[PDB]
Amino acid sequence: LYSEEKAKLLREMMAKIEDKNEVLDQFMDSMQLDPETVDNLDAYSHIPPQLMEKCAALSVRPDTVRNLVQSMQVLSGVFTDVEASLKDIRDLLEEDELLEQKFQEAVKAELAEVRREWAKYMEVHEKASFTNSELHRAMNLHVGNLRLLSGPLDQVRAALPTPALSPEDKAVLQNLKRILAKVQEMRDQRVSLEQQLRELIQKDDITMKKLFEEQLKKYDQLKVYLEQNLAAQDRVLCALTEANVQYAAVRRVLSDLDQKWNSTLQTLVASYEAYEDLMKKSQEGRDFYADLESKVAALLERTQSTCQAREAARQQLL
């Protein structure tokens, strides 16, 4: 009979709180602003734990970059050596063709096999070259980062981009977080006063009927506090929207800085995680081209021997 009056008072107050909260949420969500402001600033200067983990892990095996680069050195040397031997085989064969035509104007089997093997190894080198150039491209892609993670930490941190906000921008941000703090305080106060109202309503058990006009007076104070809370919103929203206007540009800046930070970090992680593959593919190249160099050097020997034997067999001229 009297709980219905309290339920009415509570209903009115909850209607007001719900409307105001609704508009507030529309503005706040429309501004992409949250009391957990995405200004970070602190984050930009702190090396990510996972990165420092990777650095410390590289400090236990300091022959990473060294062994990789040296492997690529050997590989390159064998590469150009193979090219040189192939060229020498070609030259010897063309000289033999010349001498054979001269001899034949004024007057085998092994030679054909040699020529075929030469074309064969020329093609093998041709196809492997793509693999090799891909390996060099990966080397360029990752070696610098692998060398950065293997060095001092201050350089790893130096690689990360940092803000350079003018003092004006700093003031703008501080004002924005001040107003956002006021909004948060206002919301916490709103929920707190709500719970105080519910608590006093629930425990208010009473025992002509004008007594209601007297016993409902115990809510007048909480109603004053709540009206003050709800009526202060429009102004703090005006201030917050003005500050946000002054904040759009710094938002742009710090957003681009965020994405650059993340891209840098991701590239460094990618290089660290690619090292192993780099090493195994470099070892594969070294094996492939050590064997190929072996076969091409043997072919060169047999070419010299066969062309010398042909030029010697041209003794009919004696």
Numbering used by the authors: 11 to 117, 128 to 227, 238 to 348
Article passage:
The crystallographic structure of HD-PTPCC (apo-HD-PTPCC), determined at 2.5 Å resolution, shows an elongated architecture with seven α helices (H1–H7) whose main feature is a central helix of 105 residues (H7) extending the whole length of the molecule. The overall shape resembles that of an ice hockey stick, in which H1, H6, and the N-terminal region of H7 form the blade, and H2–H5 and the rest of H7 form the shaft. The maximal dimension of HD-PTPCC is approximately 155 Å from end to end. Analysis of the structure using SOCKET identified two canonical coiled-coil motifs: one antiparallel two-stranded coil involving helices H6 and H7 in the blade and an extensive antiparallel, tightly packed three-stranded coil involving helices H3, H4, and H7 in the shaft. The topology of HD-PTPCC is such that the polypeptide chain crosses three times over the length of the protein. The extended shape of HD-PTPCC differs markedly from the V domains of Alix (AlixV) and yeast Bro1 (Bro1V) (Fisher et al., 2007, Lee et al., 2007, Pashkova et al., 2013). By contrast, in HD-PTPCC, helix H7 forms a continuous backbone that confers rigidity to the molecule. The DEER analysis is therefore consistent with an overall rigid conformation for HD-PTPCC that can accommodate local flexibility without global rearrangements, ruling out a potential mechanism of regulation by large-scale flexibility of the CC domain. Pocket A is partially occluded in the structure of apo-HD-PTPCC by the side chains of K671, D667, and E514.
HD-PTP (His domain protein tyrosine phosphatase; PTPN23) is a non-receptor tumor suppressor phosphatase (Kok et al., 1997, Toyooka et al., 2000) that regulates several ubiquitin-dependent endosomal trafficking processes such as downregulation of EGFR and PDGFRβ signaling (Doyotte et al., 2008, Ma et al., 2015), recycling of Src (Chen et al., 2012, Lin et al., 2011), and degradation of α5β1 integrin (Kharitidi et al., 2015). HD-PTP drives the degradation of mitogenic receptors by coordinating their sorting into the multivesicular body (MVB) via specific recruitment of different endosomal sorting complexes required for transport (ESCRTs) (Ali et al., 2013, Stefani et al., 2011). HD-PTP has a multidomain organization that allows coordinated binding to several ESCRTs. The CC domain of HD-PTP is solely responsible for the interaction with UBAP1, and residue F678 in this domain is essential for binding (Stefani et al., 2011).
